[PDB]
Design an enzyme around this catalytic site. Structure first.
Site, PDB file in Angstrom:
ATOM      1  N   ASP A 132       0.799  -1.232   0.000  1.00  0.00           N
ATOM      2  CA  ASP A 132       0.000   0.000   0.000  1.00  0.00           C
ATOM      3  C   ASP A 132       0.829   1.278   0.000  1.00  0.00           C
ATOM      4  O   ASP A 132       0.334   2.326  -0.449  1.00  0.00           O
ATOM      5  CB  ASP A 132      -0.913   0.051   1.225  1.00  0.00           C
ATOM      6  CG  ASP A 132      -1.840  -1.127   1.299  1.00  0.00           C
ATOM      7  OD1 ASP A 132      -2.374  -1.521   0.241  1.00  0.00           O
ATOM      8  OD2 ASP A 132      -1.992  -1.668   2.419  1.00  0.00           O
ATOM      9  N   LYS A 133       2.062   1.208   0.508  1.00  0.00           N
ATOM     10  CA  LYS A 133       2.932   2.365   0.701  1.00  0.00           C
ATOM     11  C   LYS A 133       4.357   1.848   0.832  1.00  0.00           C
ATOM     12  O   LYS A 133       4.588   0.921   1.618  1.00  0.00           O
ATOM     13  CB  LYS A 133       2.544   3.132   1.957  1.00  0.00           C
ATOM     14  CG  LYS A 133       3.276   4.384   2.152  1.00  0.00           C
ATOM     15  CD  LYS A 133       2.938   5.010   3.456  1.00  0.00           C
ATOM     16  CE  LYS A 133       3.528   6.410   3.544  1.00  0.00           C
ATOM     17  NZ  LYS A 133       3.389   7.023   4.895  1.00  0.00           N
ATOM     18  N   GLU A 183       9.658  14.202  14.650  1.00  0.00           N
ATOM     19  CA  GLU A 183       8.736  13.066  14.780  1.00  0.00           C
ATOM     20  C   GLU A 183       9.020  12.321  16.066  1.00  0.00           C
ATOM     21  O   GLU A 183      10.052  11.651  16.178  1.00  0.00           O
ATOM     22  CB  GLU A 183       8.859  12.102  13.606  1.00  0.00           C
ATOM     23  CG  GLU A 183       7.712  11.078  13.569  1.00  0.00           C
ATOM     24  CD  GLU A 183       7.531  10.526  12.185  1.00  0.00           C
ATOM     25  OE1 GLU A 183       8.323  10.928  11.319  1.00  0.00           O
ATOM     26  OE2 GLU A 183       6.614   9.719  11.963  1.00  0.00           O
ATOM     27  N   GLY A 200       3.027  13.200   5.188  1.00  0.00           N
ATOM     28  CA  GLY A 200       2.279  14.216   4.473  1.00  0.00           C
ATOM     29  C   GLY A 200       3.010  15.531   4.692  1.00  0.00           C
ATOM     30  O   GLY A 200       3.318  15.919   5.823  1.00  0.00           O
TER      31      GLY A 200
HETATM   32  C1  LIG Z   1      11.287   9.930   5.868  1.00  0.00           C
HETATM   33  C2  LIG Z   1      11.104  11.199   6.264  1.00  0.00           C
HETATM   34  O1  LIG Z   1       9.900  11.729   6.788  1.00  0.00           O
HETATM   35  C3  LIG Z   1       8.783  10.913   7.128  1.00  0.00           C
HETATM   36  C4  LIG Z   1       8.019  11.523   8.309  1.00  0.00           C
HETATM   37  C5  LIG Z   1       7.668  12.979   8.019  1.00  0.00           C
HETATM   38  C6  LIG Z   1       7.292  13.304   6.555  1.00  0.00           C
HETATM   39  C7  LIG Z   1       7.281  12.188   5.531  1.00  0.00           C
HETATM   40  C8  LIG Z   1       6.551  12.292   4.164  1.00  0.00           C
HETATM   41  O2  LIG Z   1       5.656  13.170   3.971  1.00  0.00           O
HETATM   42  O3  LIG Z   1       6.920  11.467   3.274  1.00  0.00           O
HETATM   43  C9  LIG Z   1       7.879  10.863   5.870  1.00  0.00           C
HETATM   44  O4  LIG Z   1       6.799   9.982   6.201  1.00  0.00           O
HETATM   45  C10 LIG Z   1      12.244  12.189   6.189  1.00  0.00           C
HETATM   46  O5  LIG Z   1      12.030  13.315   6.668  1.00  0.00           O
HETATM   47  O6  LIG Z   1      13.371  11.882   5.722  1.00  0.00           O
HETATM   48 MG   LIG Z   2       5.455  12.542   2.091  1.00  0.00          MG
END
Ligand SMILES: C=C(O[C@H]1C=CC=C(C(=O)O)[C@@H]1O)C(=O)O
Ligand SMILES: [Mg+2]
Length: 375
Positions: A132-133, A183, A200
């Site tokens: 899915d991702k 995060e 996102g």
């Molecule tokens: C894998 C990363 O972010 C993850 C968590 C925040 C935004 C993310 C996004 O929108 O893809 C990623 O899920 C990164 O910052 O290198």
């Molecule tokens: Mg993203």
């Protein structure tokens, strides 16, 4: 400035530095969510050794890699030193001097066209029931002529990112893992825990009204809401089996870094106990914000597309004490430095609404946090 052999962690929860080293701990963290795993058994023992040897209030700090089958970069210091996050934020609102640094070589691994083709394969795969991702990532390697001063860099990092979870981790090969993570993966304070997954992304704007409109558009974006829902649905399922109670909001909030808007969902819960910061952290990590969903499927795609090993990138960084309290944040917006070599990292969650260029550009803006720190 901070000497490179000292741990540093800056957070609204506990902010502290360490000093010296009592014992390193490299047991792989795989299955670390089980109190009967080798990892947890060895952890308890070392904390016990530490107290016997007269280490008061021992803490385990450092970093765990993306694939917890690999060794950990954790240790117990000889001592630690609280400081006030607020005092440090106020001190960093200043002009931050910088190390003159010459570039001998710079290299994007992979380069744009290759990464774009990687995104396209992963996107196509997410269009199938098989996955899915998939979170796909890339690096910038930079070689200087001079040894890099990680302590001067940290001061710039903090000044440019006063709010994020800011870390400086000494490493067994002499390197330093440095970063400005937004995060929270797992906080534990007594019997209660929280986790604030993100996924996102939308670029910040200098114009106040445009900035607000960017945040609003992000909340309305189906691609990014889908990217985020796959994360929270996953963690909700996992945490149901493990928590006395669990609070999860039905839609995401907005959070900012200096470069990016993110979608964020705060989880809060009560821990069944016989749990600690690491049992729960290892339970969650990596979420679909860093590996993908389903996890094992995504990690297979990652292994087959990425022309490098993530090692500590996309793992977790933080601390656990002998009482089971701690905090673990995702190892992003970060760099590994050793002598005159730097590696920066960024990833982006790929779904069917991902374009090859858009995710090259999103990872680009993610890379800009550490590029800004280096100039
Ligand atoms: C894998 C990363 O972010 C993850 C968590 C925040 C935004 C993310 C996004 O929108 O893809 C990623 O899920 C990164 O910052 O290198
Ligand atoms: Mg993203």
């Amino acid at each position: 400035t901070l000497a490179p052999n000292r741990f540093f962690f800056m957070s609204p929860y506990r902010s502290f530095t360490t000093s010296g080293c009592f014992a390193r701990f490299d047991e792989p963290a795989v299955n670390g969510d089980s109190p009967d795993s080798p990892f947890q058994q060895k952890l308890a023992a070392l904390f016990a050794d530490a107290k016997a040897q007269g280490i008061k209030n021992p803490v385990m700090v450092g970093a765990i890699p993306f694939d917890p089958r690999q060794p950990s970069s954790l240790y117990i210091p000889e001592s630690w030193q609280s400081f006030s996050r607020q005092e440090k934020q106020a001190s960093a609102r200043r002009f931050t001097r910088s190390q003159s640094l010459n570039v001998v070589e710079r290299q994007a691994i992979p380069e744009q066209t290759t990464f774009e083709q990687m995104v396209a394969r992963a996107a196509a795969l997410t269009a199938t029931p098989q996955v899915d991702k998939v979170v796909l990532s890339r690096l910038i390697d930079i070689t200087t002529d001079a040894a890099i001063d990680s302590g001067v860099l940290l001061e710039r990092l903090i000044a440019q990112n006063p709010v994020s979870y800011n870390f400086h981790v000494p490493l067994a090969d002499g390197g330093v893992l440095l970063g400005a993570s937004p995060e929270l993966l797992l906080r534990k304070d007594g019997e209660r825990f929280s986790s604030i997954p993100l996924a996102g992304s939308a670029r910040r704007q200098p114009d106040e009204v445009l900035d607000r409109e960017a945040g609003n558009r992000l909340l309305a974006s189906e691609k990014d809401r889908h990217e985020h829902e796959l994360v929270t649905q996953a963690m909700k399922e996992v945490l149901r089996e493990r928590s006395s109670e669990l609070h999860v909001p039905s839609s995401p909030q907005l959070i900012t870094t200096p470069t990016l808007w993110h979608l964020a969902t705060p989880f809060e819960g009560k821990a069944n106990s016989q749990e600690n910061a690491l049992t729960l952290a290892c339970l969650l990590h990596p979420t679909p914000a860093l590996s993908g969903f389903p996890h094992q499927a995504a990690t297979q795609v990652i292994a087959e597309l990425e022309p490098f090993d993530r090692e500590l990138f996309g793992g977790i960084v933080g601390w656990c004490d002998s009482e089971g309290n701690g905090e673990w944040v995702v190892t992003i917006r970060c760099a590994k430095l050793r002598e005159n070599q730097v590696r920066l990292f960024a990833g982006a969650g790929i779904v069917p609404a991902s374009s090859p260029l858009g995710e090259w550009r999103e990872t680009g803006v993610k890379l800009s946090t550490m590029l800004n720190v280096f100039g």
